[PDB]
Amino acid sequence: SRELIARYQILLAELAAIRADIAAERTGDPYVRKLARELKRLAQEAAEEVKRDPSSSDVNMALLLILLMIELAVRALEAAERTGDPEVRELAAELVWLAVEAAEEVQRNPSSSDVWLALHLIMLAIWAAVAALEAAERTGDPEVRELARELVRLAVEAAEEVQRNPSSKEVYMALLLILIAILEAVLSLLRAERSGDPEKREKARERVREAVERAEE
Amino acid sequence: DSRELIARYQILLAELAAIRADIAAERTGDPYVRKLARELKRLAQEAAEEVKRDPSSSDVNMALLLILLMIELAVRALEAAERTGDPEVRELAAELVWLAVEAAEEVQRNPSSSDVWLALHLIMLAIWAAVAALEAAERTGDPEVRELARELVRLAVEAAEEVQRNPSSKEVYMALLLILIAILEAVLSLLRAERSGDPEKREKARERVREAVERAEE
């Protein structure tokens, strides 16, 4: 039972390390390259912690989230590259750097629920950020592209505060508020994608503008 | 409340999952994939609606979160299984997604049951493994490997049906987990040979996948 889960998680970790390695080889950006090798290091260290001592559920939960964050973060860096936009790449990279820092904290303190939750919210931030930046590249409207950048910049700043103060509930909630704004913006761009008029274009723009103003509070 | 913020967030996640499912329903080109993507859309809308009517039940909120995440995964899995161009890859992924839809309905009907939640969760993990196997096999163009990967996934479909239909059996749960372990060992063998240079590594990868199928079938 527990033996089976441990075998399974070691395989997931070995696979996450290869996925990170592959992305490290494919990328054209030195920051992405550095981070993909860090994600690879983390998956390897996880496989080796589970190997030595599979019997701690704290450690198993800590290492499982790190593995899932890696899988997500690698796909997130690859998707952010697929846009060809250097600023998209750099924003995704700053969020992945924060996730790696929050993973290190989880590794050092696997019994802390606040530290685990901080990494977990940063993984959700990465997911939202990549959705926003991908939706914005499909529009080719320059103002929408800039507003989506503005939203993601706010998320980076708020994810840094969470990473550095995982037990603050107001800081945690400030990030959640920005993710809500980001998804409201994504949902407005998608509903415009599947519609007709440039009336819908300016409608979508106004909703994204309103989302950024909400986040800015 | 913090709960109020989480509920707002999950309603948006659900709205977004419904659109992703719709988009995949429109693009596909296989009628079974189309039918399933519309079911994944329906499940996301019903989840948005249940959180709206009552955000206060932690069982309901957990039941609905897993469904949304399964939808996100299942849609990417059907899309990835179509990108192979192979009608059998398509059909195997579809059978697993159909099982996940059935297991989601059971979760909706019984959100307080831990066994039923875990059954949906293991089937979502099965979908993840199955697509990794079928994608790695498409990379190789070796006909035997592609056939062994199909055999592994067919075993997972059969074992996922048994989990779906008997969520409280521990032996059946473990039987699926054992198959997923075999599938990941096979994926790991294919990717490690995809990297290497030694052209004997193809036959080495093949023999490790053969051994993985043997373990699964036990």
Numbering used by the authors:
A (entry chain B): 2 to 218
B (entry chain A): 1 to 218
Direct quotes from the study:
To investigate the photophysics of special pairs independently of the complexities of native photosynthetic proteins, and as a first step toward creating synthetic photosystems for new energy conversion technologies, we designed C2-symmetric proteins that hold two chlorophyll molecules in closely juxtaposed arrangements. For Chl dimer protein scaffolds, we chose hyperstable C2-symmetric repeat protein dimers containing symmetric pockets with tunable sizes and geometries. In this dimeric repeat protein architecture, the hydrophobic core is independent of the small molecule-binding site, enabling full customization for binding with little impact on the overall protein structure. We describe de novo-designed proteins that hold Chl dimers in precisely defined, closely juxtaposed geometries.
The X-ray crystal structure of SP1 was solved in the ZnPPaM-bound state to 2.0 Å resolution, revealing a special pair geometry closely matching that of purple photosynthetic bacteria. The r.m.s.d. between the ZnPPaM dimer in the SP1 crystal structure and its design model is 0.25 Å. Hydrogen bonds to the ring E ketone group, which has been shown to be important for modulating special pair redox potentials, form with Gln10 in both ZnPPaM molecules, in agreement with the design model. We obtained crystal structures of two holo-state designs: the first, SP1, reproduces the binding geometry of the native purple bacterial reaction center special pair with sub-Ångstrom precision, and the second, SP2, has a distinct geometry with the Chl molecules closer together. Calculations on the SP1−ZnPPaM dimer crystal structure yielded a lower excitonic coupling of 87 cm−1. Experimental low-temperature spectra of SP1−ZnPPaM in 40% glycerol showed only a modest broadening of the SP1−ZnPPaM dimer fluorescence emission band compared with the monomer, consistent with weaker excitonic coupling. SP1 exhibits weaker excitonic coupling than SP2 and the BChl special pair of purple photosynthetic bacteria, despite its close structural similarity to the latter. We found that the signs of the CD Cotton effects predicted from the crystal structures of SP1 and SP2 were consistent with the experimental signs in the Qy region.
